[PDB]
Amino acid sequence: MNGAIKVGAWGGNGGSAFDMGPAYRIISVKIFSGDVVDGVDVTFTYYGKTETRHYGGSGGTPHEIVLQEGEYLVGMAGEVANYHGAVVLGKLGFSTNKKAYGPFGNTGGTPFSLPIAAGKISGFFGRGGKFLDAIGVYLEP
Amino acid sequence: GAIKVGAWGGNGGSAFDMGPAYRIISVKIFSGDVVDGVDVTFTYYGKTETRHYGGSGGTPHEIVLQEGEYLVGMAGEVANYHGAVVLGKLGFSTNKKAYGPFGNTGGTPFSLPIAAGKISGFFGRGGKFLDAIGVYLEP
Ligand SMILES: OC[C@H]1O[C@@H](O[C@@H]2[C@@H](O)[C@H](O)O[C@H](CO)[C@H]2O)[C@H](O)[C@@H](O)[C@@H]1O
Ligand SMILES: OC[C@H]1O[C@@H](O[C@@H]2[C@@H](O)[C@H](O)O[C@H](CO)[C@H]2O)[C@H](O)[C@@H](O)[C@@H]1O
Numbered sequence: 001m002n003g004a005i006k007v008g009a010w011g012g013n014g015g016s017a018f019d020m021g022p023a024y025r026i027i028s029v030k031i032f033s034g035d036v037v038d039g040v041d042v043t044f045t046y047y048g049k050t051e052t053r054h055y056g057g058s059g060g061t062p063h064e065i066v067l068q069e070g071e072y073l074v075g076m077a078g079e080v081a082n083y084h085g086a087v088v089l090g091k092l093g094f095s096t097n098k099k100a101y102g103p104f105g106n107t108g109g110t111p112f113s114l115p116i117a118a119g120k121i122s123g124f125f126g127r128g129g130k131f132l133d134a135i136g137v138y139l140e141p
Numbered sequence: 142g143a144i145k146v147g148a149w150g151g152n153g154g155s156a157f158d159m160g161p162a163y164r165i166i167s168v169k170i171f172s173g174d175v176v177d178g179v180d181v182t183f184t185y186y187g188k189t190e191t192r193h194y195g196g197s198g199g200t201p202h203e204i205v206l207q208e209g210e211y212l213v214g215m216a217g218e219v220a221n222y223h224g225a226v227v228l229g230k231l232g233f234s235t236n237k238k239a240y241g242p243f244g245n246t247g248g249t250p251f252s253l254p255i256a257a258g259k260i261s262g263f264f265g266r267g268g269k270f271l272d273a274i275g276v277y278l279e280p
């Protein structure tokens with residue numbers, strides 16, 4: 001969009017597109033996983049107000065990443081697997097400039113990794129359905 | 142304020158940093174069993190330069206960016222070639238067409254599709270072969 005850097009769209013073509021848009025500050029990310037990744041719940045602040053978005057499906061169990069002050073999402077990885085005739089993320093994980101999280105999910109598949117040597121993730125986008133078909137990120141310094 | 146993503150590959154070789162370019166002009170990928178090295182020709186503040194990363198083997202595969210065409214994707218596979226963790230397959234995609242991957246040695250795959258932005262530089266490690274590679278991204 002306006003100087004945005006949207007890298008990704010890892011996963012399958014099913015589901016329906018979702019776009020969080022870049023955030024001003026990602027407060028917390030919650031990954032709901034089961035055999036695969038069900039959805040991602042994101043709480044962030046945009047133009048002053050605190051917002052929460054619900055992506056992917058409603059199933060799965062929550063694993064939350066809370067960004068302490070000065071901590072950012074500097075990496076993302078996982079596996080795009082086939083789950084009952086549907087290409088979705090079977091494993092997903094993130095890394096912060098402080099600790100590493102996950103991966104969350106138990107279905108193996110073709111891997112992908114996005115180690116950020118310089119920059120951070122600032123937002124999310126992708127395709128959702130009964131599960132998390134695909135996920136991508138917004139990058140910024 | 143540079144967005145450097147990745148660096149897929151091993152830890153062998155020596156680090157190289159092409160830095161960001163005003164405009165890439167072309168990229169040559171020398172490959173054999175793996176990825177021997179990459180060649181990058183680009184403009185940089187009025188000047189036109191050429192950088193080469195990796196060994197001196199392999200056969201060249203050239204991608205010549207056309208008028209208003211950029212690199213919007215990179216993918217390949219890091220591998221363990223007779224002991225050294227190097228890239229075994231490598232390819233790029235332009236907003237007009239996809240290339241390769243070039244190389245015949247598999248390993249753990251990786252891909253970097255770019256929905257918004259482009260590649261404007263490279264960095265990583267190299268030696269007799271292209272040990273690892275990363276890119277600079279821009280709006
Ligand atoms: O569907 C609602 C229930 O979903 C449960 O998670 C599921 C896992 O048990 C199963 O293995 O995988 C699927 C998809 O990955 C998950 O939906 C939750 O544990 C329940 O709390 C929830 O009610
Ligand atoms: O697979 C192609 C079709 O996928 C459909 O989405 C699926 C959902 O119905 C289902 O609940 O979840 C899976 C993954 O979570 C989705 O693939 C789309 O609705 C169709 O338009 C599409 O053709």
Ligand SMILES: OC[C@H]1O[C@@H](O[C@@H]2[C@@H](O)[C@H](O)O[C@H](CO)[C@H]2O)[C@H](O)[C@@H](O)[C@@H]1O
Binds near residue numbers: 152225
């Ligand atoms: O493997 C550890 C050492 O790797 C060296 O680089 C390798 C080159 O010597 C060799 O010719 O090629 C491979 C792949 O192209 C390189 O990994 C480093 O120069 C050493 O510093 C390092 O200890």
Ligand SMILES: OC[C@H]1O[C@@H](O[C@@H]2[C@@H](O)[C@H](O)O[C@H](CO)[C@H]2O)[C@H](O)[C@@H](O)[C@@H]1O
Binds near residue numbers: 175198200
């Ligand atoms: O080293 C000089 C020669 O290198 C050749 O490429 C090599 C391949 O033949 C071999 O199979 O794999 C290695 C590693 O990828 C390559 O270096 C070129 O094809 C020759 O033209 C060149 O003389």
